[PDB]
Write a protein that binds this ligand. Structure first.
Ligand code: CHL
Ligand code: CHL
Ligand code: CLA
Ligand code: CLA
Ligand code: CLA
Ligand code: CLA
Ligand code: CLA
Ligand code: CLA
Ligand SMILES: CC(/C=C/C=C(C)/C=C/[C@@]12O[C@]1(C)C[C@@H](O)CC2(C)C)=C\C=C\C=C(C)\C=C\C=C(C)\C=C\[C@@]12O[C@]1(C)C[C@@H](O)CC2(C)C
Ligand SMILES: CC(/C=C/C=C(C)/C=C/[C@@]12O[C@]1(C)C[C@@H](O)CC2(C)C)=C\C=C\C=C(C)\C=C\C=C(C)\C=C\[C@@]12O[C@]1(C)C[C@@H](O)CC2(C)C
Ligand code: SF4
Lengths: 203, 49, 42, 82, 249, 119, 205
C-alpha cells in the first residue's frame, strides 16, 4: 500500500496492490486491468527482462572491450551481416527449432502450470519451481537460490525485474544511437564526456 | 563465527551440493556406466537377434 | 481491457483487419509472381 | 657402423648391425624334437581320470548318463507288480 | 587345422591360378574381413556358455587371415601364414582348457561357475596365460601376426589412403573389443570366492599329462612371439606375388 | 509440542536428555535445535554431513513414539540393509506439523551402544 | 498419458483401446463412432501399403547404385517393359484381383463373418475374420498362425501402428524429394550426407 509509487501522491490502480515484484502502481492505460492479461503480461515483462539483459551484455561489453585493445568484436549493428562458418539462414533456422522447443514447453507451462516439469526421457529429472516463470530445477537453479522465504524472493525478483527494466531501455538506447549517430555506443559515451554541454542529440 | 554466523541457511546448501558431488565420484563415472556398459550390453543383444 | 477486446471483435472492425490482411497478401504475391496468366507447375 | 647424427636439438650418434640365425632354424626344430620325450610324462599316474570317483569315460557319459530315472520308473512298475 | 585348410586352399588355388579373377575381388574380401573382426566379437560377448564364446573368439581371428589374403603385398600374404600358425596353437589350447575345466564341474552356463581358483590353481594359471595370448598381447605369438597384418594392409599398393585408414580403424577396434569378452569370462568363472569347496573330490588340478600338454604347446607361442622368423621361412611369396604385380588398374 | 526424549550415546544407567519440539521439520534440524549431538564423531567441514543426502551417518534408533513419524522412503530401505526394522535415517524423514500432542522417545546413534540390556 | 502435445489434454473420445492412441486428432475428425470406426481401417490399409511401398522404392534403388543388381528408378519404373506386358492389360488385371480382394474385405467390415459361409469349398473356413476387423489372420492368412488375438494385440499392434505411421510419412518424403531433386531417394541421402550444411532443402530451392 504505502510502497513507493512512480508518481508520489497519486492513487495507484486497484489491480496493482504491491504483491507482485516491481509493482510501483504504474499502469496509466490499464493494460493489466483485468487479472488474466496481467498474468500473461507479467510473463511478457519477465522474459523481456532477461533477453535485453543478455543483449545489454551482448552489445556493451564487447564494444567496450574492443574500444580498448584486447579483442576484435565488430559493431553489433552490422553483426548480422557478417559471414560465419555457414549461411545465416540455416543458423536462424537452427535457432528456430531449438528455441521453439523451450518457447514451446514454456508455453505449455504458461497455459497450464505444473504439467511440464518432468523430463520426457529420464523421468527422475523433474524440475522444482512452483511459480509460473520461475522454473527452478537443477538445470535452472544449479544450487537453489530461488527456493527461499518471501520478502527475500520479492526482494530478489525485484532485483531481477528492476535490472531487466534497466536493460530494455539500454538496448533501445544502443539501438537509436547507432542510427542517428555514426558510431558505436561507447563513442557516444565518450564524445559526451569531452564536452557534455555541447555534444548531445543537438550535435 | 558460530554466534553471529549470518549465512548458515545458505552455506550449508553449498555443503549439501559439494559433498553430494564427491560421493557421487564426479558424475562422469556414472556416465560411462549408463552409456557404454549399457550400450554394448544392448548391442550384443541386437547383433544376436 | 475486456471492453476493448470486445469492441475490436465487432463485425466492421474485423472486416477491415481481415480484408486488409487479405489485400496485403494478394499484392505481395502479384509482386513476386506477376502476369500470372497460367499455373505452370504440373 | 657408427654414424654420427648431429640432430637439430640434441647430441645423438648411433651404431647398428644386422643379425639373424643363419640356419640353426633347423637345429632348434631338431631340439624341439623333444616331443619324442612326451612318453615319460604320459606313463605317469593320472590325476583322477583313474580315480574311484569316476566311472563313465565319454565326453558326455558321466555328465549325461542321467537316465537311471527311466530304470527307476521301471523299478517302480516292478515294485507295483510286487 | 580343419579351419586353416580353407585358407591354405584359398592361397594356393586362387591367388596362384586366377589373378585377374582375384585382383578385381580383393577389396570386398578386405571389407568382409574387417567387418568380421568386429562382428564375431560383438556376438561373442553375447553368448553365455563359454564353449561357444571360445568358438566365436576363434571366428574373430579369422578376419586377420582374410585381410592378409587381400591387400596384396609380400608381408600381408606372409603375415597370414604366421597368423594361421599362431592361431592353430592358441585356439586349440583354449578349447583343450575349456574341455578340461568342464567335465570337472558339469556346468556349462557361465553364470554359476564359482571360484574355481581355490581348488585348482594350475588350470587357472595356464588359462589366464592363453587368454593373454589371445588378447594379442605382445611377447606371445598372438601379437606379431596381427602386427604384420597391419603392416601389409598399410603398405598395400591396391589402395589410396581413403579406406587404407578407415579399415585400419575398424580393425583396431578389435583390440578394444576382445578383452571385454575374454576377461568377462575369466572374471565370472574363476575370480570370486564360491562356497567352501574344500572337498577334494571332482576337483583336482591338472595331472602330469595335461600339464605337459599345456606347457609343450605354450613354449612355441613364446618362442615365436619373441623372435618371429621361425615361421618366416617363406620365399615363395617372392614369386607368389610376382604374377599380379603390374597389369591394370 | 511433539515432546521428544533422547536416550543419548549409551552411558551407565540411562543418559537421557529432554527436549520440547514443535513438529513440522525433519529430525535432523529438530535435533540440531536442542543441540544434542547426532553425527557421532563427525565434524563440521565435509565429513559425512550437509543434510538430506547420501552417506547416511545418522542412524537414530526409535523406541517410543514410532507411530508419529513420516513413513519410510526407499533410500532408507536402501542405505539400511544392516538395520533391524527399528531404526531409520532421520535425515530424510519428518514429524507431522499437526501432531502437537505427541510423545516420542529416541535413542541416538547406534553401533556405539550396549543396550536393550535395559528394559 | 503421454499424448503428442505434453501440455494439452487428449480429447475425450480417444479413450485409448486403439493401439497408438496418442490423443491426436485436432481437427475434430473422429468425434463420431461410425466415422471413427471406418477411419481406423484406412490407417491400417494405408500404412501397410506404405510399409512395403517405401521398401520397394528404397531397396530397389539401394541395390542398383551399389551395383549388385540393376533396376530403373521407381520414378522411372512406370514406363519399364520386358515382354508380354501391355500396361493396358496389367492395369485391368491388377484392377481385377485387387477389386476382388478389396471388396470381400469391404463386405467383412460391412457384415462381419458374412464372408465364410458359402458354397465354394476348401477355403470357406479361413476367410471368416481374424476376430479383429483390421487383422484377418486365419489359417491361410496367418499360415504361421502365431497370434493369441488379445494380449499382444495391445503390445504388438502398437508396433505395427507406430511402424506404419512412420512409413506413411517416409513415402511422402520421396514424392516431394523426387519432385524437387529430380533424382533417387538414396541419391538425396547420399548428396546430403556429402555436405550436410550445404546440401539442404534451403539450397535445393
Ligand atoms: C533480436 C534482433 C535485433 C534487435 C536485430 C537487429 C538487427 N539485425 Mg539481426 N537482429 C536480431 C536478431 C537476428 N538477426 C539475425 C540476422 C541478421 C542479418 C543477416 C542482418 C541482421 C541485421 C540487423 C540490423 C537491421 C537494422 C535495422 O533494424 O534497421 C532499422 C539490426 C541491427 C542486418 C544488418 O546487420 O544491417 C546493418 C543484417 O544484414 N540480422 C538473426 C539470425 C541469426 C537473428 C536471430 O534472432
Ligand atoms: C499407385 C501409385 C502410383 C504412383 C504414385 C505412380 C506415379 C508415377 N507413375 Mg505410375 N504410379 C503409380 C501406379 C501405377 N502406375 C502405372 C502405370 C504407369 C505408366 C505407363 C507410367 C507411369 C509413370 C509414373 C510416373 C509419372 C511421372 C510423374 O508423375 O512426374 C512427376 C510416377 C512415378 C510414368 C513414368 O514412369 O515416367 C517416368 C509412365 O510412363 N505409371 C500403373 C499401371 C496402370 C500403376 C498401378 O497402380
Ligand atoms: C515489453 C516490455 C514490458 C512489459 C510487457 C511490461 C509489463 C508490465 N509492467 Mg513494465 N516496464 C517496462 C517494460 C515492460 N513492462 C520497462 C521498459 C520499464 C522501465 C521504464 C517498466 C517499468 C514498470 C514499472 C515501474 C511498473 C511496470 C508494471 C508493469 C505491469 C512503447 C513505448 C511507449 C515506447 C518505448 C520505446 C522507447 C523506450 C525507445 C505489466 C505486467 C507495473 C507493475 O505492477 O509492475 C509489475 C509498474 O509499477 N513496469
Ligand atoms: C541506459 C540508458 C541510456 C544511457 C545511459 C544513454 C546515454 C547517452 N545517450 Mg542515449 N538513448 C537512450 C538511453 C540511454 N542513453 C534511449 C532509450 C534512446 C532511444 C530514444 C537513446 C537515444 C539516443 C540518441 C539518439 C543519442 C543518445 C546520446 C547519448 C549520449 C549523450 C546524451 C544525449 O544527448 O542523449 C540524450 C538521451 C536521450 C534523449 C534518450 C535517453 C532515454 C533514456 C531512457 C532517458 C532516461 C535515462 C536513464 C534514466 C538514465 C539512467 C541513470 C543512470 C543509470 C545513468 C549519452 C552517452 C546522444 C549521443 O550520441 O551523444 C553524443 C545521441 O545522439 N541517445
Ligand atoms: C471474377 C473475375 C475475374 C477473374 C477470374 C480474374 C482472374 C485474374 N486476374 Mg483479375 N480482375 C477482375 C476480375 C477477375 N480477375 C476485376 C473485376 C478486376 C478489376 C478490379 C481485375 C483486375 C486485375 C488486375 C489489375 C490484375 C488481375 C490479375 C488476374 C490474374 C491473377 C493472377 C494471380 O493472382 O496469380 C487472373 C487471370 C492479375 C494479372 O496479371 O492478370 C492476368 C493483375 O495484375 N486482375
Ligand atoms: C490417411 C492416413 C491416415 C489415417 C486415415 C489415419 C487415421 C487415424 N489416425 Mg493417424 N497418422 C497418420 C496417417 C493416418 N492416420 C500418419 C502418417 C501419422 C504420422 C504423422 C499418424 C499419426 C497419428 C497419431 C499420433 C494419432 C493418429 C490417430 C488416428 C486416428 C484418429 C485420427 C482421425 O480420426 O483422423 C483421421 C485422419 C484422416 C482421415 C486423414 C485425412 C488426411 C488429411 C486430410 C491429409 C493430411 C495432410 C497431409 C500433410 C497432406 C485415426 C484412426 C490417433 C490415434 O489414436 O490413433 C489410433 C493419434 O493419436 N494418427
Ligand atoms: C506395393 C508393392 C510393390 C509394387 C507395386 C511394385 C512394383 C514393381 N516392382 Mg517391386 N518390390 C517391392 C514392392 C513393390 N514393387 C518390394 C517390397 C520388393 C523387395 C524389396 C520389390 C523388389 C523388386 C525387384 C527386385 C524388381 C521390382 C520390379 C517392379 C516393377 C515390375 C513388376 C515386377 O516386379 O514384376 C512382376 C512381379 C511379380 C511378382 C509377378 C513394378 C513397378 C522390377 C523392376 O524394376 O522392373 C523393371 C524388379 O526388377 N520390384
Ligand atoms: C509389421 C508388424 C510388426 C506386423 C505385426 C502384425 N501383423 Mg502385419 N503386416 C505388415 C507388417 C507388419 N505386421 C505388412 C507390411 C502387411 C502387408 C503385407 C501386413 C499384413 C497383415 C495381415 C493381413 C495380418 C497382419 C497380422 C499381424 C499381427 C501383428 C499385429 C495378422 C493378424 O493380426 O492376425 C490376427 C493379419 O491378419 N498383418
Ligand atoms: C523497451 C522495451 C519495452 C518497453 C515498454 C514500455 C516502455 C511500456 C510502458 C507502458 O506499458 C506500461 C509499462 C504501462 C502502460 O500503462 C503505460 C505504458 C507506457 C504504455 C522493450 C525492449 C526490449 C529489448 C530487448 C528484448 C533486447 C534484446 C536484445 C537481444 C535480443 C540481443 C541482441 C543481439 O543479438 C543481436 C541482435 C546482435 C548481437 O551482435 C548483439 C546482441 C545484443 C547480442
Ligand atoms: C499409402 C502410402 C504409400 C504407398 C506406396 C506404394 C504402394 C508405393 C509403390 C511404389 O514404390 C513401389 C512399391 C514400386 C514402384 O516401382 C511403383 C510405386 C507405385 C512407385 C502412403 C501414405 C501416406 C499417407 C500419409 C503420409 C498421411 C498423412 C496424414 C496426416 C498427416 C493426417 C493427419 C491428420 O488426420 C490426422 C492424423 C488427425 C487430424 O485431426 C489432423 C490431421 C493433420 C488432419
Ligand atoms: S543426509 Fe546423508 S549426507 Fe546429508 S547429512 Fe544426513 S547423512 Fe550426512
Amino acid at each position: 500500500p504505502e510502497r513507493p509509487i512512480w508518481f508520489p501522491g497519486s492513487t495507484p490502480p486497484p489491480w496493482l496492490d504491491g504483491s507482485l515484484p516491481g509493482d510501483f502502481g504504474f499502469d496509466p492505460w490499464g493494460l493489466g486491468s483485468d487479472p488474466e492479461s496481467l498474468r500473461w503480461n507479467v510473463q511478457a515483462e519477465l522474459v523481456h527482462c532477461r533477453w535485453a539483459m543478455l543483449g545489454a551484455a551482448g552489445i556493451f561489453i564487447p564494444e567496450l572491450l574492443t574500444k580498448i585493445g584486447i579483442l576484435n568484436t565488430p559493431s553489433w549493428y552490422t553483426a548480422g551481416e557478417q559471414e560465419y562458418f555457414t549461411d545465416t539462414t540455416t543458423l536462424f533456422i537452427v535457432e528456430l527449432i531449438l528455441i521453439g522447443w523451450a518457447e514451446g514447453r514454456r508455453w505449455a507451462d504458461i497455459i497450464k502450470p505444473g504439467c511440464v516439469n518432468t523430463d520426457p526421457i529420464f523421468p527422475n529429472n523433474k524440475l522444482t519451481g512452483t511459480d509460473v516463470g520461475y522454473p527452478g530445477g537443477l538445470w535452472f537453479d544449479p544450487l537453489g537460490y530461488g527456493t527461499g522465504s518471501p520478502e527475500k524472493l520479492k526482494e530478489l525478483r525485484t532485483k531481477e525485474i528492476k535490472n531487466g527494466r534497466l536493460a530494455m531501455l539500454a538496448v533501445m538506447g544502443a539501438w537509436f544511437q547507432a542510427e542517428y549517430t555514426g558510431t558505436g555506443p561507447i563513442d557516444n559515451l565518450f564524445a559526451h564526456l569531452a564536452d557534455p554541454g555541447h555534444a548531445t542529440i543537438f550535435r | 563465527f558460530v554466534k553471529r554466523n549470518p549465512k548458515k541457511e545458505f552455506l550449508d546448501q553449498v555443503k549439501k551440493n559439494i559433498y553430494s558431488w564427491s560421493y557421487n565420484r564426479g558424475y562422469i563415472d556414472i556416465f560411462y556406466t549408463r552409456v557404454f556398459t549399457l550400450g554394448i550390453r544392448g548391442l550384443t543383444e541386437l547383433t544376436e537377434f | 481491457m475486456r471492453d476493448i477486446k470486445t469492441y475490436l471483435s465487432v463485425a466492421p472492425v474485423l472486416s477491415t483487419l481481415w480484408f486488409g490482411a487479405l489485400a496485403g497478401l494478394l499484392i505481395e504475391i502479384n509482386r513476386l509472381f506477376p502476369d500470372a496468366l497460367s499455373f505452370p507447375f504440373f | 657402423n657408427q654414424r654420427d647424427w648431429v640432430v637439430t636439438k640434441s647430441i645423438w650418434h648411433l651404431s647398428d648391425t644386422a643379425i639373424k640365425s643363419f640356419y640353426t632354424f633347423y637345429a632348434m626344430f631338431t631340439v624341439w624334437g623333444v616331443c619324442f620325450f612326451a612318453s615319460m610324462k604320459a606313463s605317469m599316474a593320472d590325476p583322477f581320470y583313474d580315480s574311484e570317483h569316476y566311472r563313465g569315460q565319454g565326453g558326455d557319459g558321466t555328465v549325461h548318463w542321467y537316465y537311471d530315472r527311466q530304470e527307476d520308473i521301471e523299478a517302480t512298475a516292478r515294485g507295483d507288480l510286487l | 587345422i580343419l579351419l586353416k585348410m580353407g585358407a591354405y586352399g584359398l592361397i594356393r588355388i586362387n591367388m596362384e591360378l586366377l589373378p585377374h579373377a582375384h585382383y578385381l575381388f580383393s577389396p570386398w574380401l578386405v571389407i568382409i574381413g574387417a567387418i568380421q573382426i568386429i562382428y564375431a566379437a560383438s556376438t561373442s560377448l553375447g553368448q553365455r556358455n563359454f564353449k561357444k564364446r571360445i568358438a566365436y573368439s576363434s571366428v574373430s581371428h579369422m578376419g586377420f587371415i582374410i585381410i592378409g589374403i587381400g591387400s596384396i603385398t609380400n608381408i600381408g600374404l606372409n603375415g597370414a601364414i604366421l597368423q594361421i600358425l599362431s592361431h592353430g596353437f592358441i585356439g586349440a589350447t583354449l578349447f583343450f582348457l575349456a574341455g578340461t575345466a568342464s567335465d570337472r564341474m558339469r556346468l556349462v552356463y557361465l553364470e554359476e561357475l564359482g571360484g574355481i581358483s581355490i581348488p585348482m590353481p594350475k588350470i587357472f594359471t595356464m588359462f589366464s596365460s592363453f587368454s593373454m595370448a589371445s588378447l594379442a598381447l605382445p611377447g606371445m605369438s598372438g601379437f606379431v601376426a596381427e602386427l604384420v597384418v597391419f603392416f601389409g594392409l598399410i603398405t598395400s599398393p591396391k589402395f589410396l589412403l581413403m579406406p587404407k585408414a578407415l579399415i585400419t580403424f575398424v580393425m583396431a577396434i578389435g583390440m578394444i573389443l576382445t578383452p571385454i569378452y575374454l576377461l568377462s569370462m575369466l572374471r565370472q568363472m574363476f575370480y570370486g570366492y564360491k562356497l567352501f569347496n574344500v572337498p577334494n573330490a571332482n576337483f583336482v588340478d591338472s595331472g602330469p599329462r595335461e600339464l605337459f600338454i599345456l606347457i609343450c604347446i605354450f613354449l612355441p607361442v613364446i618362442g615365436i612371439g619373441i623372435y618371429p622368423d621361425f615361421v618366416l621361412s617363406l620365399s615363395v611369396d617372392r614369386v607368389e606375388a610376382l604374377l599380379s604385380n603390374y597389369y591394370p588398374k | 509440542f511433539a515432546f521428544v526424549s533422547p536416550r543419548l550415546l549409551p552411558d551407565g544407567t540411562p543418559d537421557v536428555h529432554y527436549r520440547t519440539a514443535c513438529g513440522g521439520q525433519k529430525l535432523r534440524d529438530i535435533m540440531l535445535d536442542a543441540y544434542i549431538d547426532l553425527y557421532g564423531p563427525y565434524d563440521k567441514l565435509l565429513l559425512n554431513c550437509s543434510g538430506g543426502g547420501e552417506c547416511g551417518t545418522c542412524i537414530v534408533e526409535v523406541v517410543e513414539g514410532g507411530e508419529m513419524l513420516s513413513p519410510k522412503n526407499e533410500v532408507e530401505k536402501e542405505k539400511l540393509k544392516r538395520k533391524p526394522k527399528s531404526w531409520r535415517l532421520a535425515c530424510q524423514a519428518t514429524v507431522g506439523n499437526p501432531d502437537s500432542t505427541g510423545q516420542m522417545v529416541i535413542q541416538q546413534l547406534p553401533e556405539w551402544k550396549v543396550h536393550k540390556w535395559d528394559k | 498419458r503421454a499424448t503428442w502435445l505434453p501440455g494439452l489434454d487428449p480429447p475425450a473420445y480417444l479413450d485409448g483401446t486403439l493401439p497408438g492412441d496418442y490423443g491426436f486428432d485436432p481437427l475434430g475428425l473422429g468425434e463420431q463412432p461410425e466415422d471413427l470406426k471406418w477411419y481406423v481401417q484406412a490407417e491400417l490399409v494405408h500404412c501397410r501399403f506404405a510399409m512395403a511401398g517405401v521398401a520397394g522404392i528404397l531397396g530397389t534403388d539401394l541395390i542398383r547404385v551399389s551395383g549388385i543388381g540393376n533396376l530403373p528408378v521407381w520414378f522411372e519404373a512406370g514406363a519399364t517393359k520386358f515382354d508380354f506386358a501391355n500396361t493396358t492389360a496389367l492395369f485391368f488385371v491388377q484392377l481385377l484381383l485387387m477389386g476382388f480382394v478389396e471388396t470381400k474385405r469391404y463386405m467383412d467390415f460391412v457384415s462381419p463373418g458374412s464372408q465364410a459361409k458359402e458354397g465354394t469349398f476348401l477355403g470357406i473356413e479361413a476367410s471368416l475374420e481374424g476376430l479383429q476387423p483390421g487383422y484377418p489372420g486365419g489359417p491361410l492368412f496367418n499360415p504361421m498362425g502365431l497370434a493369441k488375438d488379445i494380449e499382444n494385440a495391445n503390445e504388438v499392434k502398437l508396433k505395427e501402428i507406430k511402424n506404419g505411421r512412420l512409413a506413411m510419412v517416409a513415402m511422402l518424403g520421396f514424392i516431394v524429394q523426387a519432385s524437387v531433386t529430380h533424382a533417387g531417394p538414396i541419391d538425396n541421402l547420399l548428396t546430403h550426407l556429402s555436405d550436410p550444411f550445404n546440401k539442404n532443402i534451403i539450397h535445393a530451392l
